[PDB]
Design a protein around this nucleic acid. Structure first.
Ligand SMILES: [Zn+2]
Ligand SMILES: [Zn+2]
Ligand SMILES: [Zn+2]
Lengths: 78, 102, 187, 293, 190
RNA sequence: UGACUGCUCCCUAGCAUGCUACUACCG
RNA sequence: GCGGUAGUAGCAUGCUAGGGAGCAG
């Protein structure tokens, strides 16, 4: 149950990243696609988590993009 | 014939389009998906029948949600005439019995 | 369906015929009463089903219009819905590295490139205040994303190199603060 | 789609077909909008019109709701019930509707050409949201009657600040001063091209330079306007005086060069909104800085 | 439905018969009333049915002819669009080199694969990586298809200008690599 | 930007056939 | 006294047309 959760979270994260016009940079989009496709094919739940950290770092390293703090104060992420 | 349960569940959980993440807008998707997944109830393994039962319960929940969710803010009152056939196994059992209807 | 004039006429005819028959009478009276009754009965019975079909059709039409309006509404809030959902699942996952980096980004310490996974390759973050430097950087090692990194360079907003010994409590507030640490992943 | 009619306090999906802002009117509210005046056309999630190919009916009072569609009078499959009947118009929220006692708010002020003093009279005899509707309709009528005049253009150019200017086809010209900024666009063959901001007062056509320009052939100058969106917050805040000076960051020094500042400082201490009626030299020069310090 | 030709006769007969009934006359007048009204309604029946059939037939005919007219209009506009496209693409044939290679043919027929190879004015090259780049279009002018081409522009996968001074071995991993090179025929066509 | 086939479910409209019913005409 | 015919209403059956969706190669 800890593996399907991370696969669903990865799908949602890739959708959110695509909504922010990331595919307008070929290298970043290729890396994101590779990570997302690698997570869904995983068999053990440690490689999936490190790839998840790597994929989330892409969204976190975009200043304007989204508001981390507002999205953390809505009874959401801590 | 019976399909792979993973295929049916994946079709349930992952969709193209955004308007298909709101079951009340399209209840006829799950009716077809449960038609495809009926023969899994005769399998000796136990989760395989649980797939079909889960689909039936989800269909009933979606119908109840639609009726109440529409009666509440608006005042239109819905009826449950010949709609309960979709969450009972006799509607789906008749698709695999030799008598050719429609 | 008891709100139509046809129902009233049929009811009056029914009552009159029933009373006359129960009182007992001849054949011609019964024949005349039934010839005046059956037309009203048919008049009632036609509308009794026409009204039902009209009502159910109206209900279905209102249902369809509600569904169309709801779909049109739903397909116009996707960005916010997806972001809220993503952060809800990120809460539910409950991982230490993800929590660490999310809190770090929430306080101001964000990365500048993709976090590497190998025992090599460079990582660059931004440290905007002395408190974050106190929490993360102590000594010559760096703790980020539940890992260990080794500082090798510090650069300020003026791009001048700052040695590690320089940074201190009172010795810091004369500097361009948005520092940029570049480290490599410790074994 | 789903907006809000508020005088009858009714969520609605309907709107008047021929009106100022596509205003939102509930079933009975659209009804007395379409019987107290002449507005025989409405718009819903889908527009009401006969769906057979080639048919044309603007009116709604005689349409019918057929087989998941709408049909009409002259071309009549009448297996239906009429759309407009029983003091109401068919739509969602057909049950949770109230109506309006003052029948002629729109019928009075949304039916004139939005230029008489009666518009503003009734706007001041309104509620907060009704007067919001009023103000937005005044901006709408300002733009919609500004977009009925000409577009100035320079086709052969002369020395700057003294040019020639031909205008448009048959339209009149608005007032003359720099009130209307002549900031149009230039066309190379199909597209719009950098022009700048201009203003025409003296005409041989003398121009005032908001910027220094090198005008080319055909350059067109006119105000191209969008429409102001609806607003979601009230204009004025209701008058509620504060319990104390709680939540303030007080200072120790007191302004001395300004001789009418301390009592008003305390007022800002317990006043929620503050308007005054003054010419130049009424604190607008120094009292703002007084509060700032 | 109310001014049919038989409506006048039917209504007048009904009114007269019911007046006679209200007069309280004998049973013979009642029998005559019943017969006359029965035959009157019987004759009104087909006059009320055939007209309704005919109106629906006429409406269907009108709808079909309207849709036929719309189809014809669409056909005309698609014909105009195709003609415009053909005559627009005609104007780039370079009618001197094409004529020069057509006349050399022994009967006027030539393979289609050698027309762009010998008459085109512009060349586009897509390069996967740097190793392939340094073997195909190194420098500023290169030779391909027994002709000399000179570079005019280089862009990347994101369609941004790239200068040849930064296409090196060290700087290779910093570019969106599916590079597109544009050149012109030197001494010949453009 | 969305290929060629096959099967199945749901909703509406029309046509044909059959069952029953209500009046009327004819013998 | 029985049958035939003409409209009207409800119900059932099979096709055609339109729309929405599911699976398979
Ligand atoms: Zn109006
Ligand atoms: Zn209203
Ligand atoms: Zn029509």
């Amino acid at each position: 149950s800890k593996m399907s959760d991370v696969k669903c979270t990865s799908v949602v994260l890739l959708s959110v990243l695509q909504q922010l016009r990331v595919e307008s940079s070929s290298k970043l989009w290729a890396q994101c696609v590779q990570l997302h496709n690698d997570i869904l094919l995983a068999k053990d739940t440690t490689e999936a988590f490190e790839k998840m950290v790597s994929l989330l770092s892409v969204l976190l390293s975009m200043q304007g993009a989204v508001d981390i703090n507002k999205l953390c104060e809505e009874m959401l992420d801590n | 014939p019976y399909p792979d349960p993973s295929r049916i569940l994946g079709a349930g959980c992952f969709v193209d389009d955004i308007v298909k993440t709101d079951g009340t807008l399209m209840i006829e998707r799950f009716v077809s998906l449960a038609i495809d997944a009926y023969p899994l109830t005769k399998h000796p393994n136990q989760e395989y029948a649980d797939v079909f039962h889960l689909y039936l319960q989800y269909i009933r929940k979606l119908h109840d949600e639609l009726t109440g969710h529409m009666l509440d803010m608006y005042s239109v009152m819905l009826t449950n005439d010949n709609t309960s056939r979709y969450w009972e196994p006799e509607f789906y059992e008749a698709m695999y019995t030799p008598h050719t209807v429609l | 369906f008891s709100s139509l004039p046809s129902y009233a006429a049929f009811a009056t005819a029914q009552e009159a015929y029933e009373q006359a028959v129960a009182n007992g009478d001849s054949e011609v009276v019964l024949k005349k009463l039934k010839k005046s009754l059956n037309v009203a009965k048919s008049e009632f019975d036609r509308d009794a089903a026409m009204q039902r079909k009209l009502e159910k059709m109206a209900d279905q039409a209102m249902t369809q219009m509600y569904k169309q309006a709801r779909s049109e509404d739903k397909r116009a809030k996707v960005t916010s819905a997806m972001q809220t959902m993503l952060f809800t699942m990120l809460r539910k996952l409950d991982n230490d590295a993800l929590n660490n980096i999310i809190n770090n980004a929430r306080d101001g310490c964000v990365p500048l490139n993709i976090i590497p996974l190998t025992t090599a390759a460079k990582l660059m973050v931004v440290i905007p205040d002395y408190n974050t430097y106190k929490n993360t950087c102590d000594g010559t090692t760096f703790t980020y994303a539940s890992a260990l990194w080794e500082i090798q360079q510090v650069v300020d907003a003026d791009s001048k190199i700052v040695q590690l010994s320089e940074i201190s409590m009172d010795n810091s507030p004369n500097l361009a603060w948005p520092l940029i640490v570049t480290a490599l992943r410790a074994n | 789609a789903v907006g809000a009619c508020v005088l009858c306090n009714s969520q609605t999906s309907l709107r008047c077909g021929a009106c100022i802002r596509r205003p939102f009117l509930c079933c009975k509210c659209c009804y007395d909008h379409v019987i107290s005046t002449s507005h025989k056309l409405v718009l819903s999630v889908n527009p009401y019109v006969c769906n057979a190919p080639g048919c044309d009916v603007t009116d709604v009072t005689q349409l019918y709701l057929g087989g998941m569609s709408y049909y009409c009078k002259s071309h009549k499959p009448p297996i239906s019930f009429p759309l407009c009947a029983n003091g109401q118009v068919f739509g969602l929220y057909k049950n949770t509707c109230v109506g309006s006692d003052n029948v002629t708010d729109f019928n009075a002020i949304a039916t004139c050409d939005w230029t008489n003093a009666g518009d503003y009279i009734l706007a001041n005899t309104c509620t907060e949201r009704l007067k919001l509707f009023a103000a937005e309709t005044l901006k709408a009528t300002e733009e919609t009657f500004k977009l009925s005049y000409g577009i100035a253009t320079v086709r052969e150019v002369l020395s700057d600040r003294e040019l020639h200017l031909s205008w448009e086809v048959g339209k009149p010209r608005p007032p003359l001063n720099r009130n209307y900024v002549f900031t149009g666009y230039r066309v190379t063959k199909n597209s719009k091209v950098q022009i700048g901001e201009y203003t025409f007062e003296k005409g041989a056509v003398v121009y005032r330079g908001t910027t220094t320009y090198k005008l080319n052939v055909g350059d067109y100058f006119v105000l191209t306007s969008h429409t102001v969106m609806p607003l979601s917050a009230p204009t004025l805040v209701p008058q509620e005086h504060y319990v104390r000076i709680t939540g303030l960051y007080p200072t120790l020094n007191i302004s001395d060069e300004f001789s009418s500042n301390v009592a008003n400082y305390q007022k800002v201490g317990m006043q929620k909104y503050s308007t005054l009626q003054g010419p130049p030299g009424t604190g607008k020069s120094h009292f703002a800085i007084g509060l700032a310090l």
